[PDB]
Amino acid sequence: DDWEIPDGQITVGQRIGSGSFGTVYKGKWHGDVAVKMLNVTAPTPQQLQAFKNEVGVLRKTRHVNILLFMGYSTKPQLAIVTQWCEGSSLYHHLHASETKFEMKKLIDIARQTARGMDYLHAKSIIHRDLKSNNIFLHEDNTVKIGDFGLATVKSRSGSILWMAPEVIRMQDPYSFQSDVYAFGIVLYELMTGQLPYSNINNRDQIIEMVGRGSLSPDLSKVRSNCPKRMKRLMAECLKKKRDERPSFPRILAEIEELARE
Numbered sequence: 343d344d345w346e347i348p349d350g351q352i353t354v355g356q357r358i359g360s361g362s363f364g365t366v367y368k369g370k371w372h373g374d375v376a377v378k379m380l381n382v383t384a385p386t387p388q389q390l391q392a393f394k395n396e397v398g399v400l401r402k403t404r405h406v407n408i409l410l411f412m413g414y415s416t417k418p419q420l421a422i423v424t425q426w427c428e429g430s431s432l433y434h435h436l437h438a439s440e441t442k443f444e445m446k447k448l449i450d451i452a453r454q455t456a457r458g459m460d461y462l463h464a465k466s467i468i469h470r471d472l473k474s475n476n477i478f479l480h481e482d483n484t485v486k487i488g489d490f491g492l493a494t495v496k497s498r499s500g501s502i503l504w505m506a507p508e509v510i511r512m513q514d515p516y517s518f519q520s521d522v523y524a525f526g527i528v529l530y531e532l533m534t535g536q537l538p539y540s541n542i543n544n545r546d547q548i549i550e551m552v553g554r555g556s557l558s559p560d561l562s563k564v565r566s567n568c569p570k571r572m573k574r575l576m577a578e579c580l581k582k583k584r585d586e587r588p589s590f591p592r593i594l595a596e597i598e599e600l601a602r603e
């Protein structure tokens with residue numbers, strides 16, 4: 343219950359990232375921690391509630407593949423405290439760093455992401471923005487799912503590649519099934535090494551054609567050593583009709599089975 347950290351206990355160190363909604367620092371509190379402070383000094387009334395309702399969501403997560411919530415500050419600023427992870431995100435490894443993981447490692451990353459998502463969904467928490475940027479590889483080995491965006495307040499733009507067709511349409515939207523689609527696009531990333539729609543020049547073009555059903559990822563680009571179970575699972579996860587997509591228990595059980603072989 344006492345997840346509030348009193349004023350003065352945290353030594354806020356180097357600034358690690360900055361956006362409109364928030365700023366993230368490395369800091370000291372019984373060891374290393376990350377501290378995301380919200381860029382709003384005078385808190386608007388019941389925006390504090392939005393901070394409180396998130397704190398009440400993060401408070402419910404205890405799992406090795408979910409970034410460890412550790413506490414929060416109200417004074418001096420509104421702030422959220424997590425564990426400090428050494429390493430970088432799946433997005434950085436795959437698309438910036440040119441990291442070439444072995445298939446065993448690639449499946450292991452897909453496995454651990456599945457575990458974390460399965461856990462979240464089992465607690466009725468919908469992520470809403472699962473993507474390779476939000477999967478941190480701690481020690482470059484352990485998946486730590488979080489939400490590393492500092493641009494916007496969490497809906498509850500640079501995520502369109504992972505958005506399900508119904509989520510792009512906004513006809514009413516976000517659901518377990520939409521999270522599962524995003525995971526589909528992560529498997530694509532892992533198994534091809536590339537972002538989807540690499541040939542398409544324009545975002546508005548991706549929004550239009552994925553929304554109007556006329557564009558989908560090129561599944562033939564998967565590595566020649568991509569298992570058959572995974573290409574099939576990827577395709578089930580990417581299905582246009584929401585209700586045709588599998589749930590995480592069966593996704594996890596399928597990936598755990600393919601890892602064993």
Ligand SMILES: CCCS(=O)(=O)Nc1ccc(F)c(-n2cc(-c3cncnc3)c3nc(N(C)C4CCN(CC)CC4)ccc32)c1F
Nearest residue numbers: 358359366376377378400409411422424426427488489490
């Ligand atoms: C319990 C889940 C809470 S959550 O949804 O993940 N939100 C959240 C709350 C508090 C936080 F501090 C955090 N949070 C934690 C970390 C972090 C952790 N370990 C180690 N480096 C960075 C973090 N990096 C962010 N970036 C955008 C950084 C990602 C790494 N890059 C390297 C070039 C610098 C920018 C944004 C929020 C971040 C958060 F993401």
Ligand SMILES: OC[C@H]1O[C@H](O)[C@H](O)[C@@H](O)[C@@H]1O
Nearest residue numbers: 399400403408467487488489
């Ligand atoms: O607020 C919902 C949050 O649920 C979990 O803690 C996820 O790890 C995080 O990414 C998400 O933002």
